Amino acid sequence: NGPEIMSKLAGESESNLRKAFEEAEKNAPAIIFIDELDAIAPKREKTHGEVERRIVSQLLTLMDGLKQRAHVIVMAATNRPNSIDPALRRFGRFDREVDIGIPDATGRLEILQIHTKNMKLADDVDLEQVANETHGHVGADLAALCSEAALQAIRKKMDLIDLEDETIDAEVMNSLAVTMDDFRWALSQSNPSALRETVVEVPQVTWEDIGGLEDVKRELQELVQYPVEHPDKFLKFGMTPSKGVLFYGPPGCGKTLLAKAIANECQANFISIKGPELLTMWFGESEANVREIFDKARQAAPCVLFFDELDSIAKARVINQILTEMDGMSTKKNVFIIGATNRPDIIDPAILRPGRLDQLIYIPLPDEKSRVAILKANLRKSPVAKDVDL
Amino acid sequence: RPNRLIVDEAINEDNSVVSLSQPKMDELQLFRGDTVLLKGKKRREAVCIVLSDDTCSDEKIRMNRVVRNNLRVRLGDVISIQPCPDVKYGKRIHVLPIDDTVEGITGNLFEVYLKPYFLEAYRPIRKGDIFLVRGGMRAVEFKVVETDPSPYCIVAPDTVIHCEGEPIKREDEEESLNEVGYDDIGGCRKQLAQIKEMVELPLRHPALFKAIGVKPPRGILLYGPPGTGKTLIARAVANETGAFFFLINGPEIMSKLAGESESNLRKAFEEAEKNAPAIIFIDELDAIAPKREKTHGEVERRIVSQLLTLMDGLKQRAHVIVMAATNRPNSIDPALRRFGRFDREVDIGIPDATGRLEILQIHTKNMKLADDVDLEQVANETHGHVGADLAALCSEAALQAIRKKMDLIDLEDETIDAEVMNSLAVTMDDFRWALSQSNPSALRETVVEVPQVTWEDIGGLEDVKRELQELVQYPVEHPDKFLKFGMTPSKGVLFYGPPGCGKTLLAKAIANECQANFISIKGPELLTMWFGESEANVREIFDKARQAAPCVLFFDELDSIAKARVINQILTEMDGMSTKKNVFIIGATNRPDIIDPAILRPGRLDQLIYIPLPDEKSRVAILKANLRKSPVAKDVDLEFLAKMTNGFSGADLTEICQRACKLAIRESIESEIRRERERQTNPSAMEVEEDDPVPEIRRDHFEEAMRFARRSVSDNDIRKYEMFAQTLQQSRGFGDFRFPS
Amino acid sequence: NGPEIMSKLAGESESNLRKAFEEAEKNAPAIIFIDELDAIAPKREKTHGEVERRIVSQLLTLMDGLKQRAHVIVMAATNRPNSIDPALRRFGRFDREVDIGIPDATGRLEILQIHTKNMKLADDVDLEQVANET
């Protein structure tokens, strides 16, 4: 445990660490686990004493003191890789780093399928529908949602669970099933989501969601699909792939709904940062805080990170912070940078140098077939009368 | 279920006796010589033998005074009766004279007060029973505290005696009356109901929660401003059930030596684990676990980590819950707000106006009030007071009523006679003095409440009323029809108009109509964030709105920072706010062109309702509305004053109904000068009646106050808002077309 | 005194505070007095160690540990109410705050009338005139 080897006296916690690693060495092919690593080894700025430095160095020495024949591996658990003392991210101690991030929409159905096992549900509930909502929930929040819905279904049955019957009879103990509006109450009335950061997923918009623009479809296919679906033919005659286009057009003509379409078609992940999330970096002088949103894109290899209104800081830097990062990013990874704008003349011309952001695709106003496509697309949910022409 | 019955008066003198009805004998089937337990208030009980008589009613029990007081029940209250087959003989119940009517007798009195009184009855005596014995003009009540059998005892005469201790005074009663009830706490009735919902059903039913498989809570945060009795509420919750309290103080486990405070924490959690379904309480959490910035040493980090380890080390079968108490949730070490330690967080905030009446109703209990006082009136004022401040107000008013009676409370009578001790009642101007002369309010932050303005307070604007009804009421009163054909609700409108035409008095009206809470931040509270670079300080004013679910947070003059950021800080927060919560953001402005256009993107703030100048019916409505308090003469016309003031804004004609009041108060002050300055003021032909020259506002006060009227808004600036209304394209273009047939 | 319960060894000043409050509890209706409160309980910014936090918390616990039947009241003495640790201005410890400010012109005549008692003055002096200045 994390703070259990912190709540000892001085000079005794290291005895516990040595005893734990000795018990790991003596036993079978085994695995130790360190929970809450950032409470025993924070960043160097959060170390005002010295006994914590003794614990950290003891951890480093005992970590490097293992043998490859001993067959013991160490798993730690933090929340963000910049919240660790960087003296233990060197080679030999902690290198491979996996990311069990936020579960997505269809990744949320099984996590409450496993919690609704011992609870009798009725036939009106629809786990797919509640899974469709609850953006931002984590597994513990969904356990709390299930418990709150069961408690609301108990609390509506106070007409039988009375004060006159203190000992509760065996009637309601096995004859109460939760219904759908209990879930909607427990979702609506309570449960604030504990999520504000980015989310990686494949989008579900389709190509016919915005019809037309066949030249743009052919161009985006030539710039995204072909360097990843056929990577050998790009090596036959040596053409290097491009690393990003720049859309520009009138405001609100389906730019994001077009940028997500190629991500869905390629089965590629899609992160998205926006305007107000961007310029709040340099309004509060946190300029060196785009490295994390780029190496997060490095971890998910086939992604397409999408800026949005990157001219928002051109009302009066961070363009240079992306600019020093885009050239340092290699090309064997297939991450692409599509940026959107509405005032294309006010942009910095250094972003248009060949190598950084070369293509300039112009998105026009919607034509007729695209208009009937988007008009039918917005009326999926609403039942419309059959004689309503479109 | 025929168990609970009301209690009424009795005639008989026998003790530990409960009255049953002779038509109902065969359901309980217990005879005369059987012992029963009676459930009473505040979790204290007593035991009795039964009597079967006809003088009792069908649902009413006739019982004597001391067991009515041991159950703490009075006339009207309903008690329960149940059989208890665990009757047995015992050894040395510990009797003790708890009164000052002993008359100095000491030694062995128990041969005439105990041994002849108990026999030929099988007298059942529970621990804490307050039965009296009268002998020789000495009515001594023996409240036992140590009973070797459990829970009650039958006293035998062969029981050996143990009475070496000293009789004590009323202090042991003073440590039993603070086993308080639900009625002893007011001002937070909603939060009391919510925390009772959270706590009480696991505690009284430990088996059903394990039976379904739900998780009982492990830590509740009782955050709120200090002094509102956040420790009395936990005592009430624990004592209204069969719990066991344990008060861990804040700096008491900080004032020990090094290496010894953690021993106290381990001993406290071990005592909680060993005992019953219990509740510990940690007062002043932010003194033992502050934010990380306020930790320069390391021993405090050892205490914090010890708290974290012992918090996570509990089991769901142990049935112990932890309540802490801070003042603001950003004032805690955020390593203990994770899942499993402290998640559910209730908010016993500032009591409101009608929430303040019961909190001094409970303090004015033992003080004799007169008939002129009006607790509703003092409750109407005192904005900002908390419960301790109202206790101080009551004490200061009683002290001022004492201090005015120094003519009898003299220096010649050092020992004060029993006259003024029970014949002094507080009157209303004492309360007004103690409110005015003293008691600064300890409140500056926001307040959540439902407003009390009504729709007819500003008449007219029926299109705006229909629009606000369509944008606020229908997504919450009928949430299923918005799901039938999938229209998502909007999340806020933006008013704009001339300055002072009743914007806030219109925005509060829909909050009152929807029975919705209403917070309000203003201009100078807004831009003082970015003038002192506290830009990341709107997250708290948004999640405070998240906690109260049906609220309508109202900005005011949000263009105040457009004289030379925080618009971006609201802008990154509004998109992150979900839509299943029904919080709405109505913002007001006066210069609608200077606003940031990024606030007008669809999704953030879409609707643009234009509030015009007040028309005629709205003018007569607001003019009658401002004259509720002032008595006005019945011949003072108002429809003629309505259609005469034509271009006047709503904030200008609210001024002339204060100028007329000032012009009448001048004449009513001046008329009293000559009446006391009568030359040769003789008792002959004296006006014993009050003449009352100005009893109400007459006609010529308005006829003279109208002469100083001035329209504030010109014509050149109302054309600016009309031009901005034309900048919205305003349904212009093609116009009508028809579908083909 | 203020720094007298600061000039002890570590772990011994709290013994002095407990002995003082015990002597107040045992005796008559009494009054204790704490001079120079801002040297044993300053603002939180002026606390770099932790033993001063132990003294402050000991003062808080012993302050709240009194009973209304004990008849002991506590008077402190600072120079400005923003120069105290604000954890002891809550309800139950230190609420009522009087202000013996600067004496005024005619409030200055009696304060030197009481000092010129044992000094023989002549007839030409005028205490009202010197009171008018200063």
String of DSSP letters for B428-490: HHHHHHHHHSS------S---------GGGS---HHHHHHHIIIIIHHHH-TTHHHHS-PPPP
Reported residue count of chain A is: 390
Structure tokens given for A341 = 């704008």
For chain B, the chains sharing at least 3 beta-carbon pairs closer than 8 angstroms are: A, C
- The number of C-alpha atoms within 13 Å of A292 and in the hemisphere containing its C-beta is 11
A166 contacts in chain B (CB < 8 Å): 204
Would you say B505 is a known binding-site residue?
yes
Strand partners, B281: B247, B323
CB neighbour list of residue A341: distance below 8 Å, 6 or more residues apart: A246, A247, A248, A309, A310, A311, A347
Within 10 A of A155 (CB to CB), how many other CB atoms are there?
Answer: 12
Residues of B in contact with C92 (CB under 8 A): 388
Query: Closest Cα of chain B to C42: distance in Å?
Result: 15
Helix (H) or strand (E) holding B234: helix B232-239
Which chain B residues touch C60 with a CB distance below 8 Å? 251
Report yes or no: C17 at the B interface, CB cutoff 8 Å: no
Residue at token pair 């009982």: B216
Option in A151, A154, A276 nearest B571 (CB): A276
Q: Which of B399, B384, B401, B395 is nearest to B360 (CA)?
A: B395
Chain-centre distance for alpha carbon A305:
12
Contacts of B565 in chain A (CB under 8 A): 283
B44 within 8 A of B119, measured Cβ to Cβ = no
Sort B572 into a burial class: Cβ within 10 Å, 0-12 / 13-18 / 19+: middle
C-alpha distances (whole Å) from B649 to each of B507, B624, B655, B714 are 18, 15, 10, 10
Residue A253, chain B, CB below 8 Å: the answer is no
- Closest chain B CA to residue C47: B296
Sheet-wide strand order for B278-282? B245-248, B278-282, B320-324, B219-223, B344-347
Cβ-defined contact of C61 to B255 (cutoff 8 Å): yes
Q: Which residue from B116, B108, B112 is spatially nearest to B163, judged by alpha carbons?
A: B108
- Sequence-distant (≥ 6) Cβ neighbours of residue A30 within 8 angstroms: A24, A71, A72
Which tokens in the block code for residue C106?
Answer: 């005619």
β B132-134/B60-62 pair status? unpaired
Cα end-to-end distance, chain A, whole Å: 63
Q: How far is CA B67 from CA B152, B158, B376, B663, in A?
A: 14, 26, 37, 66
* Side chain identity at residue A369, one-letter code: K
Residue B196 · residue B238 · CB < 8 Å: no
Q: How many CB atoms lie within 10 A of CB C133?
A: 7
Closest C-alpha among C56, C61, C18, C64 to residue C37: C56
Q: Which residues have a Cβ under 8 Å from the Cβ of B416 and sit 6 or more positions away?
A: B409
Residue to mutate among A6, A121, A309, with most B CBs inside 10 A, is: A6
**What letter does residue A60 receive in the DSSP assignment?**
H
Question: B440 and chain C: CB distance < 8 Å anywhere?
Answer: no
B221 is in an annotated binding site: no
* Spatial distance between the Cα atoms of B132 and B143, rounded to a whole number of angstroms: 9
> CA torsion angle for B260, B265, B266, B272 (degrees, to 10)?
150
CA distance A82 to A100: 16
**Chain A residues in contact with B201 (beta carbon < 8 A):** 151, 154-155
The reply to whether residue B254 touches residue C57, judged by beta carbons under 8 angstroms, is yes
Q: Does A276 sit within 8 Å of B575, measured CB to CB?
A: yes
Q: Which chains touch A (3 or more CB pairs under 8 A)?
A: B
Q: Report the distance separating Cα B325 and Cα B221, nearest Å.
A: 6
Tell me if residue A361 falls in helix, strand or coil.
Answer: strand
C67 touches chain B (CB under 8 A): no
B254 and C90 within 8 Å at the Cβ level: the answer is no
Asked if B135 is an interface residue toward chain C (Cβ–Cβ < 8 A), one would say no
From residue B331, give the alpha-carbon distance in Å to each of A197, B120, B326, B327, B443.
Answer: 23, 65, 8, 7, 18
CB distance B536–A284 less than 8 Å? Answer: yes
Contacts of A351 (CB under 8 A, 6+ apart): A246, A319, A323, A339, A357
Task: Tally A–B CB contacts below 8 A.
Answer: 96
Query: In units of Å, what resolution does this entry have?
Result: 3.7
Two structure tokens written together for B367: 């003080």
Question: Quick check: B305 and A3 CB within 8 A?
Answer: yes
> Cβ atoms within 10 A of the Cβ of B78, count?
14
Beta bridge partners of B445: none
Contacts of C16 in chain B (CB under 8 A): none
Angle of helix A180-188 versus helix A139-155 axis, rounded to 10:
120
CB contact under 8 A, C58 and B255: yes
Distance, CA of B131 to CA of B127 (rounded, Å): 11
The answer, for B565 touching chain A at a CB cutoff of 8 Å, is yes
Method underlying the structure: cryo-EM
Contact present, B4 and B40 (Cβ < 8 Å)? no
Instruction: Report yes or no on chains C and A touching (3+ CB pairs under 8 A).
Output: no
Largest CA distance in chain B: 113
Residues 26-65 of B with CB under 8 A from A: none
Separation between Cα atoms, residue B190 and residue B515, nearest integer Å = 14
Task: Say yes or no: A164 contacts chain B, CB-CB below 8 A.
Answer: yes
Of B208, B296, B487, the CB nearest to A48: B296
| C-alpha–C-alpha distance, residues B16 and B33, integer Å | 12
Q: φ, ψ for residue B120 (rounded to 5)?
A: 40, 35
Residue with tokens 């201090």: B403
Structure tokens, B68: 């009515």
Q: Which of A134, A131, A130, A172 is nearest to A153 (CA)?
A: A172
CB B551 within 8 A of CB B518: yes
Q: Extract the tokens encoding C9.
A: 């060894």
- Write the burial class of residue A263 (CB in 10 Å: 0-12 exposed, 13-18 middle, 19+ buried): buried
Say if residue B631 is preceded by a cis peptide, omega within 30 of 0. no
Indicate the angle between helix axes B387-403 and B428-436, nearest 10 degrees. Answer: 120
